[PDB]
Design a protein around this ligand. Sequence first.
Ligand SMILES: [Zn+2]
Ligand SMILES: [Zn+2]
Length: 49
Amino acid sequence: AQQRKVIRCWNCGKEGHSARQCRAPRRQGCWKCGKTGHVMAKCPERQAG
Ligand SMILES: [Zn+2]
Ligand SMILES: [Zn+2]
């Protein structure tokens, strides 16, 4: 049904801008999984937590 989306703001995920202007608090360091300061460079990707 509603199949349409505008530029999704990376970092927070909001159709309206990108990651250069978005820095909300809810932000998530990594993005392939979404967690916090941690990033793909050091993302555990599902661990013992
Ligand atoms: Zn945003
Ligand atoms: Zn991550």
